[PDB]
Every structure is written in C-alpha cells, then in structure tokens.
Scaffold this active site. Structure first.
Site, PDB file in Angstrom:
ATOM      1  N   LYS A  46       0.813  -1.219   0.000  1.00 44.44           N
ATOM      2  CA  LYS A  46       0.000   0.000   0.000  1.00 44.44           C
ATOM      3  C   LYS A  46       0.850   1.274   0.000  1.00 44.44           C
ATOM      4  O   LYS A  46       0.419   2.307  -0.516  1.00 44.44           O
ATOM      5  CB  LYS A  46      -0.992  -0.001   1.164  1.00 44.44           C
ATOM      6  CG  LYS A  46      -2.264   0.796   0.882  1.00 44.44           C
ATOM      7  CD  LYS A  46      -3.165   0.878   2.110  1.00 44.44           C
ATOM      8  CE  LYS A  46      -3.490   2.329   2.465  1.00 44.44           C
ATOM      9  NZ  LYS A  46      -4.778   2.472   3.223  1.00 44.44           N
TER      10      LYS A  46
ATOM     11  N   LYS B 101      12.984  -1.806  -2.117  1.00 50.17           N
ATOM     12  CA  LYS B 101      11.692  -1.432  -1.560  1.00 50.17           C
ATOM     13  C   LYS B 101      11.471   0.051  -1.835  1.00 50.17           C
ATOM     14  O   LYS B 101      12.301   0.897  -1.487  1.00 50.17           O
ATOM     15  CB  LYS B 101      11.614  -1.743  -0.065  1.00 50.17           C
ATOM     16  CG  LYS B 101      10.213  -2.149   0.419  1.00 50.17           C
ATOM     17  CD  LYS B 101      10.259  -2.725   1.843  1.00 50.17           C
ATOM     18  CE  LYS B 101       8.995  -3.527   2.191  1.00 50.17           C
ATOM     19  NZ  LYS B 101       9.285  -4.732   3.036  1.00 50.17           N
TER      20      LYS B 101
ATOM     21  N   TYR C  38      18.233  -9.849  -1.612  1.00 51.09           N
ATOM     22  CA  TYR C  38      17.246 -10.533  -2.437  1.00 51.09           C
ATOM     23  C   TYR C  38      17.053 -11.987  -1.995  1.00 51.09           C
ATOM     24  O   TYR C  38      18.028 -12.705  -1.757  1.00 51.09           O
ATOM     25  CB  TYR C  38      17.662 -10.463  -3.903  1.00 51.09           C
ATOM     26  CG  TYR C  38      16.777 -11.266  -4.826  1.00 51.09           C
ATOM     27  CD1 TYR C  38      15.405 -11.049  -4.871  1.00 51.09           C
ATOM     28  CD2 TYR C  38      17.317 -12.236  -5.669  1.00 51.09           C
ATOM     29  CE1 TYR C  38      14.591 -11.790  -5.731  1.00 51.09           C
ATOM     30  CE2 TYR C  38      16.516 -12.979  -6.531  1.00 51.09           C
ATOM     31  CZ  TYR C  38      15.156 -12.755  -6.561  1.00 51.09           C
ATOM     32  OH  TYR C  38      14.374 -13.499  -7.424  1.00 51.09           O
ATOM     33  N   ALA C  39      15.798 -12.411  -1.875  1.00 50.96           N
ATOM     34  CA  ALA C  39      15.497 -13.817  -1.607  1.00 50.96           C
ATOM     35  C   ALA C  39      14.801 -14.441  -2.807  1.00 50.96           C
ATOM     36  O   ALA C  39      13.605 -14.220  -3.019  1.00 50.96           O
ATOM     37  CB  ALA C  39      14.628 -13.957  -0.360  1.00 50.96           C
TER      38      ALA C  39
ATOM     39  N   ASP D  19       6.803  -9.354  12.674  1.00 52.09           N
ATOM     40  CA  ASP D  19       5.619  -9.982  12.123  1.00 52.09           C
ATOM     41  C   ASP D  19       6.084 -11.124  11.231  1.00 52.09           C
ATOM     42  O   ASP D  19       6.582 -10.951  10.124  1.00 52.09           O
ATOM     43  CB  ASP D  19       4.759  -8.978  11.345  1.00 52.09           C
ATOM     44  CG  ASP D  19       3.279  -9.343  11.364  1.00 52.09           C
ATOM     45  OD1 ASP D  19       2.658  -9.259  12.453  1.00 52.09           O
ATOM     46  OD2 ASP D  19       2.746  -9.739  10.302  1.00 52.09           O
TER      47      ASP D  19
ATOM     48  N   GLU E 244       3.619 -14.663   4.906  1.00 55.86           N
ATOM     49  CA  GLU E 244       3.767 -13.785   3.749  1.00 55.86           C
ATOM     50  C   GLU E 244       4.858 -12.729   3.924  1.00 55.86           C
ATOM     51  O   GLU E 244       5.246 -12.080   2.958  1.00 55.86           O
ATOM     52  CB  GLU E 244       2.435 -13.117   3.440  1.00 55.86           C
ATOM     53  CG  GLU E 244       1.237 -14.028   3.684  1.00 55.86           C
ATOM     54  CD  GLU E 244       0.554 -13.733   5.007  1.00 55.86           C
ATOM     55  OE1 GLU E 244       0.038 -14.674   5.652  1.00 55.86           O
ATOM     56  OE2 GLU E 244       0.525 -12.544   5.390  1.00 55.86           O
ATOM     57  N   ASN E 245       5.321 -12.544   5.161  1.00 58.14           N
ATOM     58  CA  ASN E 245       6.497 -11.721   5.445  1.00 58.14           C
ATOM     59  C   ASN E 245       7.760 -12.569   5.583  1.00 58.14           C
ATOM     60  O   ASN E 245       8.844 -12.045   5.828  1.00 58.14           O
ATOM     61  CB  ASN E 245       6.275 -10.866   6.695  1.00 58.14           C
ATOM     62  CG  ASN E 245       4.928 -10.172   6.690  1.00 58.14           C
ATOM     63  OD1 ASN E 245       4.192 -10.206   7.682  1.00 58.14           O
ATOM     64  ND2 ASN E 245       4.599  -9.535   5.577  1.00 58.14           N
TER      65      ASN E 245
ATOM     66  N   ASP F  50       9.695  -8.713   7.245  1.00 58.83           N
ATOM     67  CA  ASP F  50       9.156  -7.744   8.185  1.00 58.83           C
ATOM     68  C   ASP F  50       9.322  -6.307   7.676  1.00 58.83           C
ATOM     69  O   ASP F  50       9.087  -6.012   6.502  1.00 58.83           O
ATOM     70  CB  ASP F  50       9.866  -7.910   9.535  1.00 58.83           C
ATOM     71  CG  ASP F  50       8.912  -7.860  10.706  1.00 58.83           C
ATOM     72  OD1 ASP F  50       7.860  -8.531  10.630  1.00 58.83           O
ATOM     73  OD2 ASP F  50       9.218  -7.159  11.696  1.00 58.83           O
TER      74      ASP F  50
HETATM   75  O1  LIG Z   1       6.702 -13.087  -6.607  1.00 57.48           O
HETATM   76  C1  LIG Z   1       7.546 -13.950  -6.242  1.00 57.48           C
HETATM   77  O2  LIG Z   1       7.403 -15.147  -6.606  1.00 57.48           O
HETATM   78  C2  LIG Z   1       8.709 -13.517  -5.407  1.00 57.48           C
HETATM   79  C3  LIG Z   1       8.506 -12.791  -4.234  1.00 57.48           C
HETATM   80  C4  LIG Z   1       9.590 -12.371  -3.470  1.00 57.48           C
HETATM   81  C5  LIG Z   1      10.882 -12.678  -3.881  1.00 57.48           C
HETATM   82  N1  LIG Z   1      12.037 -12.285  -3.124  1.00 57.48           N
HETATM   83  C6  LIG Z   1      12.111 -11.156  -2.249  1.00 57.48           C
HETATM   84  N2  LIG Z   1      13.323 -10.810  -1.799  1.00 57.48           N
HETATM   85  C7  LIG Z   1      13.477  -9.756  -0.975  1.00 57.48           C
HETATM   86  C8  LIG Z   1      12.337  -9.044  -0.600  1.00 57.48           C
HETATM   87  C9  LIG Z   1      11.070  -9.419  -1.069  1.00 57.48           C
HETATM   88  N3  LIG Z   1       9.891  -8.687  -0.680  1.00 57.48           N
HETATM   89  C10 LIG Z   1       8.587  -9.287  -0.748  1.00 57.48           C
HETATM   90  C11 LIG Z   1       7.990  -9.415  -1.994  1.00 57.48           C
HETATM   91  C12 LIG Z   1       6.733  -9.985  -2.122  1.00 57.48           C
HETATM   92  C13 LIG Z   1       6.057 -10.439  -0.995  1.00 57.48           C
HETATM   93  C14 LIG Z   1       6.647 -10.320   0.257  1.00 57.48           C
HETATM   94  C15 LIG Z   1       7.905  -9.744   0.385  1.00 57.48           C
HETATM   95 CL1  LIG Z   1       8.579  -9.625   1.970  1.00 57.48          CL
HETATM   96  N4  LIG Z   1      11.003 -10.485  -1.898  1.00 57.48           N
HETATM   97  C16 LIG Z   1      11.081 -13.405  -5.047  1.00 57.48           C
HETATM   98  C17 LIG Z   1      10.000 -13.816  -5.813  1.00 57.48           C
END
Ligand SMILES: O=C(O)c1ccc(Nc2nccc(Nc3ccccc3Cl)n2)cc1
Length: 264
Positions: free
Chosen positions: A18, A37, A87-88, A131, A135-136, A149
């Site tokens: 949001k 972000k 990055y994850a 949190d 989803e976080n 978070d």
């Molecule tokens: O869309 C997908 O498959 C997908 C979602 C997140 C991914 N990685 C990532 N890394 C670092 C931060 C971050 N923020 C975030 C994004 C979406 C939802 C929640 C968070 Cl915390 N998300 C990779 C792929």
C-alpha cells in the site's frame, strides 16, 4: 557513499504494498542483484509514519542474521524512500505453503528453529514483535528462511481469497485486547506458525473477525488427527493466554519434537 535510483537497473515488481513496491533490481556496475523497496512517502505522510520508519532503517541496518533479511542501505530522492534489500530468490513461504497445502515435520521444525534463532538474536538486540506470518517470510538461496518484516505489507499477485482476512490470526490476545505487550508475543506467533505449517490453516481462522477474536482470546483451537503429540505439546505450550506461561526461545529449540525432526 550515498546511492541514488540510477545506480540501479529495475526488473519486475516482486510484490506490491500500500505504501509502495518491492522491485527486483541490480547495482549497475557489479551487476549484483538485490531488492528495492520503494515507499511513496505521500501515503507515508497520511498514515503518519515517517519518524519511526527513519529510525527503523537505523535499527534494521544494524542487524545481521542468516535468517533475517538484510538491509544493505537506504536513500531518498524527493518523493520516495528506498530500502536496499537482500534478495530472496525463492519468494514467500506463503506461496510454498499454498503449493503443498501443508508442510511436514522436517520442514516445520527446521523453519521453527530458523525463526527461533532470528527472534532470539532479535531480542538480544532489543528488537521485539517481528511480524512472522508466512507472507512476510521469504526463502533464500536454497532452503533458508528469512524474516522480511520491516516495511508494510507486500503481496506478490495471486489468489485473492484471503486478502486479509489474514490479520488477527497471528495476533496474540494481549495485542488484540489493547494491552502492553512484551517479548513473549512473538512466541504466540511461533505457535500459530507451527500449527499453520502442519495443518495448512491457522488455528483461529474463521469467517468473521469477531469469531476469530472469540477463539484467540479464549484460546480455543483443535488439531486434526495427524498432528503428532510432540507437535501438539509444543504448540500447546506455545499458545497460552498468559504470556508468562509460554516458553523462552531456547526452550523451543530444546524441545524434544523440535530436536527430533529439525534439520538445523
Ligand atoms: O513473486 C515472487 O514469486 C517472489 C517474491 C519475493 C521474492 N524475493 C524477495 N526478496 C526480498 C524481498 C522481497 N519482498 C517481498 C515481496 C513480495 C512479498 C513479500 C515480500 Cl517480503 N522479496 C522473489 C519472488
């Protein structure tokens, strides 16, 4: 020294919140990938959060854990604030949970250890109430679990279903009830996560906010048959109306059922 937007290439939005979006990104020279972000700051004004965001990047920049998503840096231009994030690759444990519909005890107990370690690290740094609803939570290089978070709630596009609707499920009776909350909230969360991992849904889920509140406050939740007793005992010990009655974090790590099925 101080970054700015053009030091980065921008890929797709990973999720949209949001207050803004998390974009897939890479530093221009190193060609190294990260997550940006982006916070609109106009919606920050209204929502009345600027200050505490601004000492957040203070506190979170100081944090280092394998299981905590690392904040590399931050900058602003005029109209936007930018968090430079680790990055994850594998996304949200909430998607993964949506895949299999449920986890097993290996997966679970290992995630739980991973989580307990972060929070335990967090407390020592005087950081409470993270949190940790699914989803976080993000998934790193191969299997690893990361608490994201921080900034305010982001969704990758999907589903819709439960939008939220996902709110109080993870909120402890003391927090819902508008009362001074202490480190022990996060152990309530842990109890709720664990349950959801094995069941596929949270213990207090209900079609009305009111009813959800009813179940939480009165701690009414029932396991499906397959839940192992050692699972039950940990959950049960974890979800208690009284904060003081809930384990300290290492108790969790020491738990019989944890240690049995935990890869970590
Ligand atoms: O869309 C997908 O498959 C997908 C979602 C997140 C991914 N990685 C990532 N890394 C670092 C931060 C971050 N923020 C975030 C994004 C979406 C939802 C929640 C968070 Cl915390 N998300 C990779 C792929």
């Amino acid at each position: 020294r101080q970054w700015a937007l053009e030091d980065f290439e921008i890929g797709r939005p990973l999720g949209k919140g949001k207050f803004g979006n998390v974009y897939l990104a890479r530093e221009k020279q190193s060609k190294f990938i990260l997550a940006l972000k982006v916070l609109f700051k106009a919606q920050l004004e209204k929502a009345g959060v600027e200050h505490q965001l601004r000492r957040e990047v203070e506190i979170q920049s100081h944090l280092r854990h394998p299981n905590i998503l690392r904040l590399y840096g931050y900058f602003h231009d005029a109209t936007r604030v930018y968090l430079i994030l680790e990055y994850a690759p594998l996304g949200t444990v909430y998607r993964e949970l949506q895949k299999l519909s449920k986890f097993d005890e290996q997966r679970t107990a290992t995630y739980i250890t991973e989580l307990a370690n972060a929070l335990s690290y967090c407390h020592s740094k005087r950081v409470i109430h993270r949190d940790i609803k699914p989803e976080n939570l993000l998934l790193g290089s191969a299997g690893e679990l990361k608490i994201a978070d921080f900034g305010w709630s982001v969704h990758a596009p999907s589903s819709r279903r439960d939008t939220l609707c996902g709110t109080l499920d993870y909120l402890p009776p003391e927090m819902i009830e508008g009362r001074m909350h202490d480190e022990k909230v996060d152990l309530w969360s842990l109890g709720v996560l664990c349950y959801e991992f094995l069941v596929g849904k949270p213990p207090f889920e209900a079609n009305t906010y009111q009813e959800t509140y009813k179940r939480i406050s009165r701690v009414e939740f029932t396991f499906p048959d397959f839940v192992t007793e050692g699972a039950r005992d940990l959950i049960s010990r974890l979800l208690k109306h009284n904060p003081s009655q809930r384990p300290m974090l290492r108790e969790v790590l020491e738990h019989p059922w944890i240690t049995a099925n935990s890869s970590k």
